[PDB]
Amino acid sequence: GEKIKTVSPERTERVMDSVMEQRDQIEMMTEALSDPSLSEGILDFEDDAAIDEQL
Amino acid sequence: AGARQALKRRAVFMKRLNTVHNTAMNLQAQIDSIQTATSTAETVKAMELGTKVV
Cβ-contact A54, B3 below 8 angstroms: no
Please give the resolution of this entry in Å, rounded to 1 decimal.
Answer: 2.9
Q: Which of B7, B12, B15 sits opposite A55 (nearest CB)?
A: B7
Cβ-contact A51, B8 below 8 angstroms: yes
Nearest to A54 by CA among B46, B12, B26: B12
Tell me the C-alpha distance between B34 and B41, whole Å.
11
Which of B4, B15, B16 should one mutate to test binding to chain A, selecting the residue with the greatest count of A CBs within 10 A? B4
Nearest to A51 by CA among B32, B3, B13: B3
Give the residue from chain A lying closest to B3, CA to CA.
Answer: A55
